[PDB]
């Protein structure tokens, strides 16, 4: 029962004798506004239906987000082949400065202070996957010494 908000909804189509049939797509993101967040992309022959699907996929997928009084723990360069995105911790009272896409993501991640920017490609779809796989790479102080401990 986390918070929910879509990113965008396109209307791809297919060619075929006589005419062209469509299939709408919708990107959506979920989060409690505190570490728990997930993204989902759902395709379906109709608008509200495609959202409904995205809903299940979004709540399906999910990732823990090591917060820090509203900010992230450290910066990360994450290249999803085509696109590239970089995050960077900010002192409280800064804000969530980013693109339309990575804004919603981090916003539902309970974030309130972060420096970011998109490079190379800017495809909203690809940018999404980049931000997700970015947070998934985040590592708290504990997580580091935990793996480096190995005792």
């Amino acid at each position: 029962d986390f918070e929910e908000k879509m990113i965008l909804i396109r209307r791809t189509a297919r060619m075929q004798a006589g005419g062209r049939r469509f299939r709408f797509g919708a990107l959506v993101v979920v989060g409690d506004r505190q570490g728990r967040v997930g993204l989902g992309f759902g395709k379906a022959p109709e608008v509200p239906l495609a959202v409904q699907k995205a809903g299940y996929y979004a709540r399906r997928n999910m990732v823990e987000v090591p917060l820090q009084n509203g900010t992230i723990p450290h910066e990360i360069e994450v290249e999803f082949g085509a696109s590239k995105i970089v995050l960077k911790p900010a002192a409280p009272g800064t804000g969530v400065i980013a693109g339309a896409v990575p804004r919603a993501i981090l916003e539902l991640a309970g974030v309130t202070d972060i420096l970011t920017k998109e490079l190379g490609s800017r495809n909203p779809i690809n940018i999404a996957y980049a931000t997700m796989e970015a947070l998934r790479q985040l590592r708290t102080k504990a997580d580091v010494e935990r793996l480096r401990k190995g005792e």
Binding site: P92, G93, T94, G95, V96, I97, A100, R103
Partner: protein, 208 residues
């Protein structure tokens, strides 16, 4: 100066009850209580989800219209905050509250903020002795925001002070209702304030 134009009108656009007025805004009629929808031939129609921009915009406009102050000066203070250290967001609000014509409102001397500008401008008010008429003037901590001698026995001054009996106000403030004067104890913590505006969005907007 401030937009003299209809003000109970804005309450409707913002979608939030706004006490630009005084007695009437508190009565069953801030304008919004009768028409909870925005102005315009429309407004009574199904709106659409605003862009991240529209939202960050409609949030800033709220805070600006509240203090009913020039966009120029407003933006100047937002920057003023970014200049200094500390949490920019709250501090911005802190300087808005430190404004003189504002304190007169938060000290009860006036029923309205725009009315507060009136008195202050006409020099009815005073600080430590000087008849400061600059609605601007950043009120430093520890200052006598008294009332000028000639202005002490004013008709509209009394009605305000009489109704301002008892009633706790401004934790960061004090008020000598007898001698007609108050004090700016300290800078108002974000926790001490409470406004319909989310400062975090207002910062994001001036990030552009």
């Amino acid at each position: 100066g401030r937009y003299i134009g209809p003000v109970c009108r804005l309450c409707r656009r913002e979608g939030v009850k706004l006490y630009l007025k005084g007695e009437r805004c508190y009565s069953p009629k801030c304008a919004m209580e009768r028409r909870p929808y925005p102005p315009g031939q429309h407004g009574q129609k199904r709106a659409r989800r605003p862009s991240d921009y529209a939202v960050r915009l409609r949030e800033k406009q709220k805070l600006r219209r509240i203090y009913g102050i020039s966009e120029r000066q407003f933006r100047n203070l937002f920057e003023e905050a970014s200049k200094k250290k500390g949490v920019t967001g709250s501090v911005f609000l802190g300087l808005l509250e430190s404004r003189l014509d504002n304190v007169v409102y938060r000290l009860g001397f006036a029923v309205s903020r725009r009315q507060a500008r009136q008195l202050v401008r006409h020099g009815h008010i005073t600080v430590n002795g000087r008849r400061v008429d600059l609605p601007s003037y950043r009120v430093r901590p520890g200052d006598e925001i008294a009332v000028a001698e000639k202005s002490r026995n004013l008709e509209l001054i009394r009605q305000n002070l009489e109704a301002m009996k008892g009633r706790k106000v401004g934790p960061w403030l004090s008020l000598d209702v007898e001698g007609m004067k108050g004090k700016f104890l300290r800078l108002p913590d974000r926790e001490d304030l409470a406004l319909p505006v989310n400062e975090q969005l207002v910062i994001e907007f001036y990030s552009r």
